[PDB]
Structure 1
Amino acid sequence: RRVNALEQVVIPGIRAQIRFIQQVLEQREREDTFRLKRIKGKIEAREAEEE
């Protein structure tokens, strides 16, 4: 009973939690990359105001 309980309940829940956490972290990383891209664009656009 204990073996079946572990294999059928405990492991899938932990695996699902791991999947969810990884996806959340990846989303935050993507958003920060977008912010950095905008910042670099603004830095490039500032350097040519009057030539």
Structure 2
Amino acid sequence: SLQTSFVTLDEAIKITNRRVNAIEHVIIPRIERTLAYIITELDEREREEFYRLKKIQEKKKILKEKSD
């Protein structure tokens, strides 16, 4: 009764220690460098909005220098 539960236990340990190491090494390092890509790409959408708004505030100043 202790031989048949022994050899079926390390059959269910290798299918669990692989599923733990499939998450720590394949699934989580794919998500944590996906999330590193969202932040670097959302910083570039803010500077493109920063450049479009500073372009307009430079144009609105020139039109207010004519009407003086």
- Using the size of structure 1 for normalisation, the TM-score is 0.89
Greater share of residues in helix? 1
Task: Select which of 35, 42, 47 maps to 1:30.
Answer: 47
Q: CA shift at 1:36, angstroms?
A: 0.5
CA distance in 2 between partners of 1:42 and 1:21 (Å):
32
Q: CA deviation digits over 1:2-47, x for unaligned, max 9?
A: 1111111110000111111111111010110011001001111101
CA distance in 2 between partners of 1:40 and 1:13 (Å):
41
Supply the RMSD in Å over aligned alpha carbons: 1.0
Provide the identity percentage: 41
Task: Select which of 8, 20, 25 maps to 2:25.
Answer: 8
**5+ unaligned residues in a row in structure 1: which ranges?**
none
CA distance in 2 between partners of 1:50 and 1:35 (Å):
23
- Using the size of structure 2 for normalisation, the TM-score is 0.69
